[PDB]
Amino acid sequence: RETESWKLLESSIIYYEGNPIGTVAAQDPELAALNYDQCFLRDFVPSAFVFLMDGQTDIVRNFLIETLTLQSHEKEMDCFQPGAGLMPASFKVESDGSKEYLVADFGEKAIARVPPVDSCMWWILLLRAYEKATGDLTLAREPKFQAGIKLILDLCLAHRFSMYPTMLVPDGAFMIDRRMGVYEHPLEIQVLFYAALRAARELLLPDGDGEQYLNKVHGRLGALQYHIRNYYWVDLKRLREIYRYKGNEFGKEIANKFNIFSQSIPDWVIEWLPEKGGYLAGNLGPGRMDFRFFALGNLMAILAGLASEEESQRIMNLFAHRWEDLIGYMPVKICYPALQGLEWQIVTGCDPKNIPWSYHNGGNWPVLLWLFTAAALKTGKVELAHEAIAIAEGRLSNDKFPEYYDGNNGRLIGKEARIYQTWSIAGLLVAKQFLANPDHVEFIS
Amino acid sequence: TESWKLLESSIIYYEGNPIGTVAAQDPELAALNYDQCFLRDFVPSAFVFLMDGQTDIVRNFLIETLTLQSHEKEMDCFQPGAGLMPASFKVESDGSKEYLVADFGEKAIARVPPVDSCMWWILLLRAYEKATGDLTLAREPKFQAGIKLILDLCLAHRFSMYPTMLVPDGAFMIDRRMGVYEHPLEIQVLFYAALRAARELLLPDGDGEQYLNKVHGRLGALQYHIRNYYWVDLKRLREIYRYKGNEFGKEIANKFNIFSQSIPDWVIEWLPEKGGYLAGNLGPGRMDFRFFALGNLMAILAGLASEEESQRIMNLFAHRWEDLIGYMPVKICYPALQGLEWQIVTGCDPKNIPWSYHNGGNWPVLLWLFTAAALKTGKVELAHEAIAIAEGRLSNDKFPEYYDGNNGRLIGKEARIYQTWSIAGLLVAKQFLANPDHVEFIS
Amino acid sequence: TESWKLLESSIIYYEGNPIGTVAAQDPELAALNYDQCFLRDFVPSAFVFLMDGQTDIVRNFLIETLTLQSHEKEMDCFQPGAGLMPASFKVESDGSKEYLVADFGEKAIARVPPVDSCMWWILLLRAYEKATGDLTLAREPKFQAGIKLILDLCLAHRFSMYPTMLVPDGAFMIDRRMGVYEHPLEIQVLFYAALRAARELLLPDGDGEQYLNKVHGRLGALQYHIRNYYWVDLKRLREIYRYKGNEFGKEIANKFNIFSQSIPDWVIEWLPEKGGYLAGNLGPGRMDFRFFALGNLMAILAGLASEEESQRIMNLFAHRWEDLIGYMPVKICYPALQGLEWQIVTGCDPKNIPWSYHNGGNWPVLLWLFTAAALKTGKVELAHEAIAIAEGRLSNDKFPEYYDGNNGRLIGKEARIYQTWSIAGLLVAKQFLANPDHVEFIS
Ligand SMILES: OC[C@H]1O[C@](O)(CO)[C@@H](O)[C@@H]1O
Ligand SMILES: OC[C@H]1O[C@](O)(CO)[C@@H](O)[C@@H]1O
Ligand SMILES: OC[C@H]1O[C@](O)(CO)[C@@H](O)[C@@H]1O
Question: Which Pfam families does the entry link to (chains B, C) (predicted)?
Answer without folding.
Answer: Glyco_hydro_100 (PF12899)
